Design a protein around this ligand. Structure first.
Ligand SMILES: Cc1cn([C@H]2C[C@H](O)[C@@H](COP(=O)(O)OP(=O)(O)OP(=O)(O)O)O2)c(=O)[nH]c1=O
Ligand SMILES: Cc1cn([C@H]2C[C@H](O)[C@@H](COP(=O)(O)OP(=O)(O)OP(=O)(O)O)O2)c(=O)[nH]c1=O
Length: 288
């Protein structure tokens, strides 16, 4: 399975922080926002990843993250000229995807919880159908909404319904089989001028293979949409990290724990960073 991080958009609510740059370049506590969804693709076992952003921001992502080699993965880059919808990721990414399965994660989504790595690897290892991830939120009408029965079978999925049929938002992480490319090429813009991921997911519902993994109350799916929520998200990460000795979405750590790089390679990443706490964390990990 390949992975795409869709990381453009407008971030207009965050102005002036986004006057020049895209929101996913901004900090969430101690690392750029985009580290968090990239870490999720990596934990899923995905090592070939395309990052899509605006014409002006795609090079900024590339200057931050590089080509992947030092994390033992492959990062590629492509441009989305206008934010004409999430489903456009599969069109821009058609060549990249080829005949493979592909996961899509949004560059501003932050997932954290016990047992998540197992759920990701399960989804990434499926060879047919779509997996989406549902989360109980206060205001479901603001989101794609997934309705399911007592057995966990999807009944419906609607984009910002007037009268939400459940409390479960569909989060910005999706795993698809290769049918997604031609599905995306065949949907049409919604009223709001967007090629909708909800329409992609409707197509898999109709195909009888839309699977939902319900993230329970013990999971965190953090909002980065406003100044207030961004700050809350930062405080959340700080609190987890302070108590334990452990960082959330430390890319180099994940690359080592996933076996993408060796202990020797980790040591070599840590060395030039030894003046700061991040490098020291990496070296402590190498030492144990
Ligand atoms: C619709 C769309 C979203 N996005 C991404 C960017 C983010 O990672 C995520 C959210 O983007 P948006 O859907 O643009 O929402 P926003 O919160 O960035 O904008 P605003 O504050 O102005 O309401 O989806 C794209 O990259 N391209 C697109 O075509
Ligand atoms: C291993 C690892 C996990 N994570 C994230 C993924 C999940 O959101 C969260 C928990 O990771 P998991 O791998 O799900 O670990 P866990 O809490 O299940 O504990 P264990 O399996 O050790 O009993 O931490 C990182 O950010 N970096 C990492 O190196």
């Amino acid at each position: 399975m390949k992975g795409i991080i869709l990381s453009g958009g407008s971030g207009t609510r965050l102005y002036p922080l986004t006057k020049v740059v895209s929101k996913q370049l901004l900090p969430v506590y101690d690392k750029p926002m985009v580290y968090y969804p990239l870490s999720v693709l990596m934990l899923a076992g995905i090592k070939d990843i395309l990052i899509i952003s605006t014409p002006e921001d795609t090079p900024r992502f590339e200057q931050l993250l590089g080509g992947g080699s030092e994390l033992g993965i492959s990062l590629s880059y492509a441009v989305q000229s206008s934010p004409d919808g999430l489903a456009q990721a599969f069109i821009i990414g058609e060549e990249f995807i080829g005949d493979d399965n592909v996961a899509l994660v949004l560059g501003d989504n932050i997932f954290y919880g016990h047992g998540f790595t197992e759920l990701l690897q399960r989804a990434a290892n499926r060879k047919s159908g779509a997996t989406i991830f549902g989360y109980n939120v206060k205001d479901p009408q603001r989101f794609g909404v997934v309705e399911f029965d007592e057995k966990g079978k999807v009944i419906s999925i609607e984009e910002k319904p007037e009268e939400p049929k459940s409390s479960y938002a569909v989060t910005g992480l999706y795993f698809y089989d290769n049918r997604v490319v031609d599905i995306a090429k065949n949907i049409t813009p919604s009223a709001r001028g967007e090629l909708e991921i909800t329409d992609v997911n409707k197509a898999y519902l109709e195909l009888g293979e839309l699977h939902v993994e319900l993230l329970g109350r013990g999971f965190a799916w953090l909002d980065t949409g406003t100044h207030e929520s961004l700050l809350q998200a930062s405080q959340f990460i700080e609190t987890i990290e302070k108590r334990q000795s452990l960082k959330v979405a430390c890319l180099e750590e994940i690359a080592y724990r996933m076996g993408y790089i060796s202990r020797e390679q980790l040591i070599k990443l840590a060395e030039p960073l030894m003046k700061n706490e991040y490098g020291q964390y990496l070296m402590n990990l190498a030492h144990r």
